[PDB]
Amino acid sequence: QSVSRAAITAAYRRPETEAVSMLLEQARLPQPVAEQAHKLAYQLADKLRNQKNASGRAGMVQGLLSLSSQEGVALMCLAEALLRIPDKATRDALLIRKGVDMAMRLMGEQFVTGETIAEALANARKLEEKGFRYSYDMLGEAALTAADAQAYMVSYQQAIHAIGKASNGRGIYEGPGISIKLSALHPRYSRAQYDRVMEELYPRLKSLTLLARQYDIGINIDAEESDRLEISLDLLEKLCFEPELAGWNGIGFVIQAYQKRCPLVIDYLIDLATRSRRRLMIRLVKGAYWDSEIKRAQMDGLEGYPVYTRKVYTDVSYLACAKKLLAVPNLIYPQFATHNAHTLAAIYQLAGQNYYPGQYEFQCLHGMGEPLYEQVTGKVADGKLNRPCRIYAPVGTHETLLAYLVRRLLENGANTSFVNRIADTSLPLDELVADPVTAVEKLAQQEGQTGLPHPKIPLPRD
Numbered sequence: 001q002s003v004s005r006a007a008i009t010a011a012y013r014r015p016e017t018e019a020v021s022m023l024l025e026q027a028r029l030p031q032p033v034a035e036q037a038h039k040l041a042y043q044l045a046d047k048l049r050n051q052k053n054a055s056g057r058a059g060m061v062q063g064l065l066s067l068s069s070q071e072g073v074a075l076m077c078l079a080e081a082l083l084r085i086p087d088k089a090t091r092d093a094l095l096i097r098k099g100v101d102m103a104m105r106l107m108g109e110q111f112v113t114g115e116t117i118a119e120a121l122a123n124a125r126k127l128e129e130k131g132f133r134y135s136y137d138m139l140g141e142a143a144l145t146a147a148d149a150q151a152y153m154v155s156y157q158q159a160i161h162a163i164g165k166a167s168n169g170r171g172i173y174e175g176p177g178i179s180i181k182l183s184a185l186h187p188r189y190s191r192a193q194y195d196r197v198m199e200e201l202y203p204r205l206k207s208l209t210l211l212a213r214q215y216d217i218g219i220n221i222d223a224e225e226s227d228r229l230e231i232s233l234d235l236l237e238k239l240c241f242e243p244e245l246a247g248w249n250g251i252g253f254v255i256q257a258y259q260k261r262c263p264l265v266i267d268y269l270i271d272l273a274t275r276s277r278r279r280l281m282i283r284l285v286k287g288a289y290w291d292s293e294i295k296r297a298q299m300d301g302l303e304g305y306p307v308y309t310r311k312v313y314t315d316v317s318y319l320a321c322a323k324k325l326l327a328v329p330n331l332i333y334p335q336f337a338t339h340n341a342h343t344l345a346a347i348y349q350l351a352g353q354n355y356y357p358g359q360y361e362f363q364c365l366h367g368m369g370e371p372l373y374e375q376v377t378g379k380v381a382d383g384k385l386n387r388p389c390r391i392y393a394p395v396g397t398h399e400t401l402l403a404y405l406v407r408r409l410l411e412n413g414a415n416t417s418f419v420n421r422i423a424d425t426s427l428p429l430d431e432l433v434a435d436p437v438t439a440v441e442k443l444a445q446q447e448g449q450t451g452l453p454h455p456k457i458p459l460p461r462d
């Protein structure tokens with residue numbers, strides 16, 4: 001393997017104390033930057049939470065209470081009835097499968113942009129008028145048969161034609177793009193071998209990428225489970241050297257900060273952009289498959305996890321990786337995917353003075369990020385930050401929704417998730433937007449060393 005490929009492999013399941021200790025001084029915000037990130041994060045999270053005055057209203061409720069909850073309700077029901085007395089004088093003087101299917105569809109609706117690419121493309125004008133951008137995700141993954149993969153191929157091809165016509169020359173930055181999953185383009189990808197992936201999957205990836213280039217829209221390769229990282233790099237490496245793609249910078253690639261390999265993957269990507277003479281569109285995410293990654297490692301009984309076991313470590317990893325990406329704007333267009341107010345504010349500060357549109361963009365999932373990003377994308381005059389956000393827009397029917405929805409349920413329902421915590425009016429804003437580096441050092445001082453694994457998540461062999 002090349003030097004940078006070797007380093008990736010060696011870091012696969014690096015001990016957490018060692019990986020976190022390494023990332024820490026790379027992720028640490030210089031003092032004035034930390035202060036500004038904190039102030040901005042606090043302000044974003046304050047507006048997000050208290051837009052319709054949720055905390056003030058909760059603090060009138062508690063302030064009334066000397067009664068019980070359900071009691072105070074009884075009173076309000078009465079006070080409401082009294083306020084419906086028109087005249088104040090009078091007032092004063094006085095099966096299992098189908099249950100799961102329905103619940104999925106009902107909870108999943110909010111995360112879906114449209115049933116078909118045409119409906120999706122139509123629902124996007126409203127936010128596009130405001131400076132938002134889109135990346136369309138034709139739902140459907142883990143193709144089991146040759147036929148399934150073929151259908152996904154056809155669906156992607158048709159989406160590119162529709163998106164590309166809608167883009168009408170706006171280009172890879174200002175115009176919409178598409179996101180694809182490699183698992184959709186090859187039967188039984190989860191266990192597919194190198195030779196068959198190259199022989200069958202690659203011609204599909206190349207074909208779609210060339211079509212995306214013809215319309216000049218971005219084409220992003222989503223990141224999936226950790227044991228597919230390697231083959232996805234081999235596929236990316238070959239793609240970047242196609243003569244037909246020379247001089248074109250619309251190839252996009254996701255990297256997952258929850259993996260120990262992430263910074264090493266960045267070193268590889270930097271070298272690849274250099275050798276293949278292009279700017280790569282790189283989406284930095286934390287990661288969508290954490291629960292399954294943990295479970296898989298525990299069943300396979302290997303020496304360690306390929307992901308961090310404490311959420312704060314992933315946050316620290318994201319910040320370190322963000323700095324690495326921002327240091328090479330000639331080689332990488334970073335796309336910072338997050339719904340976390342601190343993370344956003346930190347990136348905003350880390351990106352430095354003198355923003356220009358092609359420096360970087362934020363990204364968010366449809367149904368999750370719009371309220372936060374409504375403070376971000378737009379004009380300074382309107383009280384926004386004037387930073388563009390690209391909305392990830394799932395497209396498809398109920399038959400294609402299950403796996404995506406489950407990942408959204410895990411993301412939204414986890415007590416460690418920012419989106420879950422901000423919805424807790426009890427949890428103070430300062431804790432919500434607490435600096436992850438400082439949080440890691442707190443743990444270290446309490447525990448006896450830096451980057452210990454989650455106490456409840458022993459090594460697979462233990």
Ligand SMILES: Cc1cc2nc3c(=O)[nH]c(=O)nc-3n(C[C@H](O)[C@H](O)[C@H](O)COP(=O)(O)OP(=O)(O)OC[C@H]3O[C@@H](n4cnc5c(N)ncnc54)[C@H](O)[C@@H]3O)c2cc1C
Nearest residue numbers: 222223285286287288308309310311314337338339417418
């Ligand atoms: C536009 C967009 C595209 C994305 N594309 C992909 C993709 O192609 N592939 C992919 O894997 N993910 C992808 N993601 C990420 C995933 O879908 C989540 O949205 C993202 O991880 C949430 O991060 P955060 O900064 O919003 O939230 P936060 O609440 O800040 O962070 C939550 C994340 O922390 C991580 N985490 C949770 N618990 C632990 C723990 N105990 N130990 C270590 N880490 C933990 C998980 O990654 C979790 O998602 C994408 C996200 C966005 C917004």
